[PDB]
């Protein structure tokens, strides 16, 4: 598993580091999207948050209670290239402004558990 997830990141890992070099076909950026996804949810185990990366996946994590009826829910969405680098660490939550969309309290949290996988 940690070794398939290595491998489907290094696949795209030329064009995470350079996005002129060649785009991935659409089956390399969903199994490195989809695999870098579920290492969080194993690294976080939990349900308070979820981090949404169409059209490839969703995942829940980090442990705690389900969030108060009347208040946001817990997610973090945004597009595959921009969770790669979240997710690899070329790129700092706390930086990726707009292209990165958060509600809920502990949402910012998912800052904690990353990056799962550095190249």
Same mark, same amino acid.
């Given at each position: +598993?940690?070794? #398939?997830?290595?491998? &489907?990141?290094?696949?795209? &890992?030329?064009?995470?580091?350079? %996005?002129?070099?060649?785009?991935?076909?659409?089956?390399?950026?969903?199994?490195?999207?989809?695999?870098?996804?579920?290492?969080?949810?194993?690294?976080? %185990?939990? $349900? /308070?948050?979820?981090?949404?990366?169409? %059209?490839?996946?969703?995942?829940?994590?980090?442990?705690?209670? #389900?969030?108060?009826?009347?208040?946001?829910?817990?997610?973090?969405?945004?597009?595959?290239?921009?969770?790669?680098?979240?997710?690899?660490?070329?790129? +700092?939550? $706390?930086? $990726?402004?707009? /292209?990165?969309?958060? /509600?809920? /309290?502990? &949402? $910012?949290?998912?800052?904690?558990?990353?990056?799962?996988?550095?190249?």
């Amino acid at each position: +598993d940690p070794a #398939k997830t290595l491998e &489907a990141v290094s696949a795209v &890992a030329d064009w995470l580091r350079d %996005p002129q070099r060649e785009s991935p076909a659409r089956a390399q950026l969903a199994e490195a999207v989809r695999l870098t996804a579920r290492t969080l949810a194993a690294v976080a %185990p939990g $349900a /308070s948050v979820e981090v949404r990366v169409p %059209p490839f996946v969703a995942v829940q994590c980090i442990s705690g209670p #389900k969030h108060t009826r009347g208040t946001p829910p817990n997610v973090v969405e945004t597009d595959a290239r921009t969770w790669l680098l979240l997710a690899t660490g070329l790129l +700092d939550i $706390a930086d $990726a402004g707009a /292209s990165v969309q958060m /509600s809920g /309290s502990r &949402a $910012a949290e998912v800052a904690h558990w990353l990056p799962v996988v550095r190249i």
